[PDB]
Amino acid sequence: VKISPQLLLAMHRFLATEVEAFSPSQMSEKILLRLLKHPNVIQELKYDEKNKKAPEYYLYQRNKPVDYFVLILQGKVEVEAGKEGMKFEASAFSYYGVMALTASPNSSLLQVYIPDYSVRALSDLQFVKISRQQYQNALMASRMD
Amino acid sequence: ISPQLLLAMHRFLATEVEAFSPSQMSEKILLRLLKHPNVIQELKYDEKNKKAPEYYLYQRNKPVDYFVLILQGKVEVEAGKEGMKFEASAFSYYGVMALTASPVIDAVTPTLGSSNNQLNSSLLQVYIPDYSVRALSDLQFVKISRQQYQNALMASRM
């Protein structure tokens, strides 16, 4: 996935200033930029009007454990929030699932992040995808530089 | 719910499954737990509406908080990464770790089932089965939740 340097700067500046998880206090800007340039962190998704309700077009499903964070860069998504599944539209720079990253910790149970919402693609999507593991590694890397 | 069958399953759990061993749970309490309402359940099978959500006792990558012991009937089990399919019948049990798994250390998030402020928290300690269980016929089975199991332990602790 090839993106322009301008777009990379915009998403970098937004996360570093708006999302505390990526604040310079938690994560150095040098590491953050490397994390964004990491392969498959930035992804795209081709939309199919025929298969609109396909599983490949659901970034999040309510009551389905997930372990990654998303930042929409381009495109439209439908969001189903709450018990009644209140639908509304979200576009660029709407993010989801930060708690999957920043949540603090064989025969044990597992702490998971379960979204109280669903996110479905309405059109072609370009977005960021950062897993808890990628984020925790980014903290350790920035925790020593 | 014949007395003969109830004793058989009691002896099986108390001897085969350590979670219900006399060391963990007295045999007197175990019997009371089995006679507890809704611990023993049934399920009518519909050949027309097979693969229905009401016929899945367990679903892959779907958090669960209960234990099952088949008493009568057949189920299809899809186990592991490669989804090895096999058939299981009476006295096949599932989800023991759902009961005996210990919580995360120095963790404040609530466990699924206990409902300790779960209604508003998105972080939940869960047991996630690496398998699926689908009903192939009418089922009679035991169903013990983590909370019902923990309550049985406290009862036997006195």
Side-chain angles (χ1 to χ4, degrees), chain A residues 63-65 99-105 107-117 132, chain B residues 61 63 97-98 100-109 111 122-128 146:
Chain A
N63 296 124
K64 184 178 183 298
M99 266 188 289
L101 312 182
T102 62
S104 57
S107 183
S108 296
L109 295 171
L110 176 69
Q111 183 174 268
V112 299
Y113 164 76
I114 300 180
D116 188 22
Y117 54 88
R132 180 184 177 83
Chain B
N61 297 124
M97 265 190 289
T100 62
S102 57
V104 181
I105 318 158
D106 298 285
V108 303
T109 59
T111 304
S122 296
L123 297 171
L124 297 179
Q125 303 185 43
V126 299
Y127 167 78
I128 300 179
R146 182 185 179 84

Coordinates of all heavy atoms in Angstrom, one line a residue, chain A residues 63-65 99-117 132, chain B residues 61 63 97-98 100-109 111 122-128 146, unseen atoms left out:
Chain A
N63 N -19.8 -7.5 20.4 CA -19.7 -8.7 21.2 C -18.8 -9.8 20.5 O -19.0 -11.0 20.7 CB -21.0 -9.3 21.5 CG -21.9 -8.4 22.3 OD1 -23.0 -8.1 22.0 ND2 -21.4 -8.0 23.5
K64 N -17.8 -9.3 19.7 CA -16.8 -10.2 19.1 C -15.4 -9.7 19.6 O -15.0 -8.6 19.2 CB -16.9 -10.2 17.6 CG -15.9 -11.1 16.9 CD -16.1 -11.1 15.4 CE -15.2 -12.1 14.7 NZ -13.7 -11.8 15.0
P65 N -14.7 -10.5 20.4 CA -13.4 -10.0 20.9 C -12.5 -9.6 19.7 O -12.4 -10.2 18.7 CB -12.8 -11.2 21.6 CG -14.0 -12.0 22.1 CD -15.1 -11.8 21.0
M99 N -8.9 1.0 23.4 CA -8.8 0.2 24.6 C -8.1 -1.1 24.4 O -7.5 -1.7 25.3 CB -10.2 0.0 25.2 CG -10.5 1.0 26.3 SD -12.1 0.6 27.1 CE -13.2 0.9 25.8
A100 N -8.3 -1.7 23.2 CA -7.6 -2.9 22.8 C -6.1 -2.8 23.0 O -5.4 -3.8 23.3 CB -7.9 -3.3 21.4
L101 N -5.5 -1.6 22.8 CA -4.1 -1.4 22.9 C -3.6 -1.1 24.3 O -2.7 -1.7 24.8 CB -3.7 -0.2 22.0 CG -4.2 -0.2 20.5 CD1 -3.5 1.0 19.8 CD2 -3.8 -1.5 19.8
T102 N -4.3 -0.1 25.0 CA -3.8 0.5 26.2 C -4.3 -0.3 27.4 O -3.8 0.1 28.6 CB -4.2 1.9 26.3 OG1 -5.6 2.1 26.3 CG2 -3.6 2.7 25.1
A103 N -5.1 -1.2 27.3 CA -5.6 -2.0 28.4 C -4.4 -2.7 29.1 O -3.5 -3.2 28.5 CB -6.6 -3.1 28.0
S104 N -4.4 -2.6 30.5 CA -3.3 -3.1 31.3 C -3.6 -4.5 31.7 O -4.8 -4.9 31.8 CB -3.1 -2.3 32.5 OG -4.3 -2.2 33.3
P105 N -2.6 -5.4 31.9 CA -2.8 -6.8 32.2 C -3.4 -7.0 33.6 O -4.3 -6.3 34.0 CB -1.4 -7.4 32.1 CG -0.5 -6.3 32.3 CD -1.2 -5.1 31.7
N106 N -1.9 -20.3 29.9 CA -2.2 -21.7 29.8 C -3.5 -22.0 30.6 O -4.6 -22.2 30.0 CB -1.1 -22.6 30.3
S107 N -3.4 -21.9 31.9 CA -4.6 -22.2 32.8 C -5.2 -20.9 33.2 O -6.2 -21.0 34.1 CB -4.1 -23.0 34.0 OG -5.2 -23.3 34.8
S108 N -4.8 -19.8 32.8 CA -5.4 -18.5 33.1 C -6.4 -18.0 32.1 O -6.5 -18.6 31.0 CB -4.3 -17.4 33.3 OG -3.4 -17.7 34.3
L109 N -7.2 -17.0 32.5 CA -8.1 -16.4 31.6 C -7.4 -15.4 30.7 O -6.2 -15.2 30.9 CB -9.3 -15.8 32.3 CG -10.2 -16.7 33.1 CD1 -11.2 -15.9 34.0 CD2 -11.0 -17.6 32.2
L110 N -8.1 -14.7 29.8 CA -7.5 -13.8 28.9 C -8.3 -12.5 28.9 O -9.6 -12.5 28.8 CB -7.5 -14.4 27.5 CG -7.0 -13.4 26.4 CD1 -5.5 -13.2 26.5 CD2 -7.3 -14.1 25.0
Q111 N -7.7 -11.4 29.1 CA -8.3 -10.1 29.0 C -8.4 -9.7 27.6 O -7.4 -9.6 26.9 CB -7.5 -9.0 29.8 CG -8.1 -7.7 29.8 CD -7.4 -6.7 30.7 OE1 -7.7 -6.5 31.9 NE2 -6.4 -6.0 30.2
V112 N -9.6 -9.4 27.2 CA -9.9 -9.1 25.8 C -10.7 -7.8 25.7 O -11.4 -7.4 26.7 CB -10.7 -10.2 25.0 CG1 -9.9 -11.5 25.0 CG2 -12.1 -10.4 25.7
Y113 N -10.7 -7.1 24.6 CA -11.5 -5.9 24.3 C -12.7 -6.3 23.4 O -12.5 -6.9 22.3 CB -10.7 -4.8 23.7 CG -11.5 -3.7 23.0 CD1 -12.2 -2.8 23.8 CD2 -11.7 -3.7 21.7 CE1 -13.0 -1.8 23.2 CE2 -12.4 -2.7 21.1 CZ -13.1 -1.8 21.8 OH -13.9 -0.8 21.2
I114 N -13.9 -6.1 23.9 CA -15.1 -6.5 23.2 C -15.8 -5.2 22.8 O -16.3 -4.5 23.7 CB -15.9 -7.4 24.1 CG1 -15.1 -8.7 24.4 CG2 -17.2 -7.8 23.3 CD1 -15.9 -9.7 25.2
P115 N -15.9 -4.9 21.5 CA -16.6 -3.6 21.2 C -18.1 -3.7 21.3 O -18.7 -4.7 20.9 CB -16.2 -3.4 19.7 CG -16.0 -4.8 19.2 CD -15.5 -5.6 20.3
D116 N -18.7 -2.6 21.9 CA -20.1 -2.5 21.9 C -20.7 -1.8 20.7 O -21.6 -1.0 20.7 CB -20.5 -1.7 23.2 CG -22.0 -1.6 23.4 OD1 -22.7 -2.5 23.0 OD2 -22.4 -0.7 24.1
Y117 N -20.1 -2.2 19.5 CA -20.5 -1.6 18.3 C -20.0 -2.5 17.1 O -19.3 -3.5 17.3 CB -20.0 -0.2 18.1 CG -18.5 -0.1 18.3 CD1 -17.6 -0.3 17.3 CD2 -17.9 0.1 19.6 CE1 -16.2 -0.3 17.5 CE2 -16.6 0.1 19.8 CZ -15.7 0.0 18.7 OH -14.3 0.0 18.9
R132 N -2.6 -4.8 19.4 CA -2.1 -4.6 20.8 C -0.6 -4.9 20.8 O 0.2 -4.2 21.5 CB -2.9 -5.4 21.8 CG -2.4 -5.2 23.2 CD -3.1 -6.2 24.2 NE -2.6 -6.0 25.5 CZ -2.9 -5.1 26.4 NH1 -3.8 -4.1 26.1 NH2 -2.4 -5.1 27.6
Chain B
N61 N -13.8 -19.2 18.8 CA -13.4 -17.8 19.0 C -14.6 -17.0 19.5 O -14.8 -15.8 19.2 CB -12.9 -17.1 17.7 CG -11.6 -17.8 17.3 OD1 -11.4 -18.2 16.2 ND2 -10.6 -17.8 18.2
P63 N -16.3 -16.1 23.2 CA -16.2 -16.3 24.6 C -17.4 -17.1 25.2 O -18.5 -16.9 24.8 CB -16.2 -14.8 25.2 CG -15.7 -14.0 24.1 CD -16.2 -14.7 22.8
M97 N -12.1 -25.6 31.6 CA -11.3 -24.4 32.0 C -12.1 -23.2 32.1 O -11.8 -22.2 32.9 CB -10.2 -24.2 30.9 CG -8.9 -24.8 31.2 SD -7.6 -24.2 30.1 CE -8.0 -25.1 28.6
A98 N -13.3 -23.1 31.5 CA -14.2 -22.0 31.7 C -14.6 -21.9 33.2 O -14.8 -20.8 33.7 CB -15.5 -22.2 30.9
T100 N -12.5 -23.5 36.0 CA -11.3 -23.5 36.8 C -10.2 -22.5 36.4 O -9.2 -22.3 37.2 CB -10.7 -24.9 36.9 OG1 -10.3 -25.3 35.6 CG2 -11.8 -25.9 37.4
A101 N -10.3 -21.9 35.3 CA -9.3 -20.9 34.9 C -9.2 -19.8 35.9 O -10.2 -19.3 36.3 CB -9.6 -20.4 33.5
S102 N -8.0 -19.4 36.2 CA -7.8 -18.3 37.2 C -7.8 -17.0 36.5 O -7.4 -16.8 35.4 CB -6.5 -18.5 38.0 OG -5.4 -18.6 37.1
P103 N -8.2 -15.9 37.2 CA -8.2 -14.6 36.6 C -6.8 -14.1 36.3 O -5.8 -14.6 36.8 CB -9.0 -13.7 37.6 CG -9.6 -14.6 38.5 CD -8.7 -15.8 38.6
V104 N -6.8 -13.0 35.5 CA -5.5 -12.3 35.2 C -5.0 -11.7 36.5 O -5.8 -11.2 37.3 CB -5.7 -11.3 34.1 CG1 -4.3 -10.6 33.8 CG2 -6.2 -11.9 32.8
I105 N -3.7 -11.7 36.6 CA -3.0 -11.2 37.9 C -3.0 -9.7 37.8 O -2.8 -9.1 36.8 CB -1.6 -11.8 38.0 CG1 -1.5 -13.3 37.7 CG2 -1.2 -11.6 39.5 CD1 -0.1 -13.7 37.3
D106 N -3.2 -9.1 39.0 CA -3.3 -7.6 39.1 C -4.1 -7.0 38.0 O -3.7 -6.0 37.3 CB -1.9 -7.0 39.1 CG -1.0 -7.5 40.3 OD1 -1.2 -7.1 41.4 OD2 -0.1 -8.4 40.0
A107 N -5.3 -7.6 37.8 CA -6.3 -7.1 36.8 C -7.5 -6.7 37.5 O -8.0 -7.5 38.4 CB -6.5 -8.2 35.8
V108 N -8.1 -5.6 37.1 CA -9.3 -5.1 37.7 C -10.5 -5.3 36.8 O -11.7 -5.2 37.3 CB -9.2 -3.5 37.9 CG1 -8.0 -3.2 38.8 CG2 -9.1 -2.8 36.6
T109 N -10.4 -5.7 35.6 CA -11.5 -6.0 34.7 C -12.3 -7.1 35.2 O -11.8 -8.1 35.8 CB -11.0 -6.3 33.3 OG1 -10.2 -7.4 33.3 CG2 -10.2 -5.1 32.7
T111 N -14.8 -10.5 35.2 CA -14.9 -11.7 34.5 C -16.3 -11.9 33.8 O -17.3 -11.4 34.4 CB -14.7 -12.9 35.4 OG1 -13.4 -12.7 36.0 CG2 -14.7 -14.2 34.7
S122 N -15.8 -2.6 28.8 CA -15.5 -3.2 27.6 C -14.4 -4.2 27.7 O -14.3 -5.1 26.8 CB -15.2 -2.2 26.5 OG -16.3 -1.3 26.2
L123 N -13.5 -4.1 28.6 CA -12.5 -5.1 28.9 C -13.0 -6.2 29.8 O -13.5 -5.9 30.9 CB -11.3 -4.4 29.5 CG -10.5 -3.4 28.7 CD1 -9.5 -2.6 29.5 CD2 -9.9 -4.0 27.4
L124 N -13.0 -7.4 29.3 CA -13.6 -8.5 30.0 C -12.6 -9.7 30.0 O -12.0 -10.0 29.0 CB -14.9 -9.0 29.4 CG -16.0 -7.9 29.5 CD1 -17.3 -8.5 28.8 CD2 -16.3 -7.5 30.9
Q125 N -12.4 -10.3 31.2 CA -11.6 -11.6 31.2 C -12.5 -12.7 30.8 O -13.6 -12.9 31.4 CB -11.1 -11.8 32.6 CG -10.2 -10.7 33.2 CD -9.6 -11.0 34.6 OE1 -9.2 -12.1 34.8 NE2 -9.7 -10.0 35.5
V126 N -12.1 -13.4 29.7 CA -12.9 -14.4 29.1 C -12.2 -15.7 28.9 O -10.9 -15.8 28.9 CB -13.5 -13.9 27.7 CG1 -14.3 -12.7 27.9 CG2 -12.4 -13.7 26.8
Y127 N -12.9 -16.8 28.8 CA -12.4 -18.1 28.3 C -12.9 -18.3 26.9 O -14.1 -18.2 26.6 CB -12.9 -19.2 29.2 CG -12.7 -20.6 28.6 CD1 -11.4 -21.2 28.6 CD2 -13.7 -21.3 28.0 CE1 -11.2 -22.4 28.0 CE2 -13.5 -22.6 27.4 CZ -12.2 -23.1 27.4 OH -12.0 -24.3 26.9
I128 N -12.0 -18.5 25.9 CA -12.3 -18.6 24.5 C -12.1 -20.0 24.0 O -10.9 -20.4 23.9 CB -11.5 -17.6 23.7 CG1 -11.9 -16.1 24.2 CG2 -11.9 -17.7 22.2 CD1 -11.1 -15.0 23.5
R146 N -19.5 -20.9 35.3 CA -18.4 -20.5 36.2 C -18.9 -20.1 37.5 O -18.4 -20.5 38.6 CB -17.5 -19.5 35.5 CG -16.3 -19.1 36.4 CD -15.5 -18.0 35.7 NE -14.4 -17.6 36.5 CZ -13.2 -18.2 36.5 NH1 -12.9 -19.2 35.7 NH2 -12.2 -17.7 37.3

